[PDB]
């Protein structure tokens, strides 16, 4: 499928906008992001924050004012004349009902498909907390694609003047097995359709890798194979300095 | 050394090669050095032939890991 890239510019800002804007008791920041879809690989080059205030008692009531769509077009418009609007963006990871009746709002202004974007302000997960929905036909679903970084020097050197494998992996596979424990628990609660059409197909696609073991060690020696020439050759630049630094010796003396 | 060159020999054609004294005496000598796992190999009385049961082939398995 498609790609999503975002260069840092766009995630410090969406991260930036909660505290400057002081947001409290539980509401959300909206903002909208600029970039081009058109490609296989969405890059969103730009971000902006709007004013958004919902009811938590009432989903029925929502209000988005225009004035801030028009307004920054005509000043992207004046500046970076590449910049169109692909969608907007959410202050937190958990999604709400809303989600359709906003996308109903910039369907007009968007010439593409409104893409979702998903960040979280807490950073209460492992690795990436940014998430990115596409909503396609199902009423509407919304699908996922992974979130990468933007590589240029225009974003992530600013990053590094700011700042200055498999364990963490580990630790991400927690966090998924973590959310389908609560997820059956919960279920049973509420009873006594898609997550358990591919729960069934994970079990059956780790008791079956053991059929493979026999097969699976013809390639694991090989490694050693390849350790075991590693650590030869590694031999001949220790004693080499042994041999290099023996000659230092004999200088210092006739010295 | 007789083991190594054939899996298949006969019982009393290893106390012809090496001259022992009868089928009794080669029969507790064969068995012995397995406990150790030295011959690796297996004695069919009723074959009437001790069969080797080393088939190599440990590129499968983890010994030389």
Redesign the interface.
């Given at each position: 499928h498609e790609k999503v890239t975002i260069a840092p510019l766009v995630l410090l800002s969406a991260l930036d906008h909660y505290e400057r804007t002081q947001t409290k008791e539980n509401k959300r920041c909206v903002g909208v992001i600029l970039g081009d879809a058109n490609s296989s690989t969405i890059r969103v080059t730009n971000s902006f924050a709007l004013p958004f205030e919902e009811d938590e008692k009432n989903s029925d009531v929502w209000f988005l004012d225009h004035n801030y769509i028009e307004n920054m077009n005509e000043m992207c418009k004046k500046i970076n004349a590449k910049e169109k609007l692909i969608g907007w963006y959410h202050s937190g990871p958990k999604l709400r009902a809303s989600d359709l009746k906003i996308n109903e709002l910039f369907k007009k202004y968007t010439q593409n498909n409104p893409l979702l974007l998903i960040v979280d302000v807490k950073q209460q997960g492992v690795g990436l907390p940014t998430d990115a929905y596409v909503a396609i036909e199902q009423e509407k679903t919304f699908l996922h694609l992974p979130c990468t970084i933007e590589a240029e020097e225009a974003e992530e050197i600013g990053v590094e003047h700011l700042l200055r494998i498999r364990l963490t992996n580990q630790l991400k596979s927690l966090k998924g097995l973590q959310s389908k424990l609560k997820d059956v628990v919960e279920y049973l609660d509420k009873v006594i359709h898609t997550i358990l059409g591919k729960l069934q197909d994970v079990f059956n696609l780790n008791n079956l890798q053991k059929a493979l073991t026999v097969k699976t060690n013809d390639e694991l020696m090989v490694i050693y194979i390849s350790n075991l020439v590693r650590s030869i050759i590694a031999f001949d630049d220790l004693i080499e300095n042994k041999i290099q630094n023996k000659k230092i010796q004999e200088q210092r003396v006739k010295d | 050394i007789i083991s190594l060159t054939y899996k298949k020999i006969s019982l009393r054609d290893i106390c012809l090669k090496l001259n022992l004294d009868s089928e009794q005496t080669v029969e507790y000598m064969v068995s012995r050095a397995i406990r150790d796992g030295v011959i690796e190999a297996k004695i069919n009385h009723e074959d009437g032939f001790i069969e080797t049961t080393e088939l190599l082939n440990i590129?499968?398995?983890?010994d030389?890991?």
């Open positions: - | 590129y499968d398995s983890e030389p890991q």
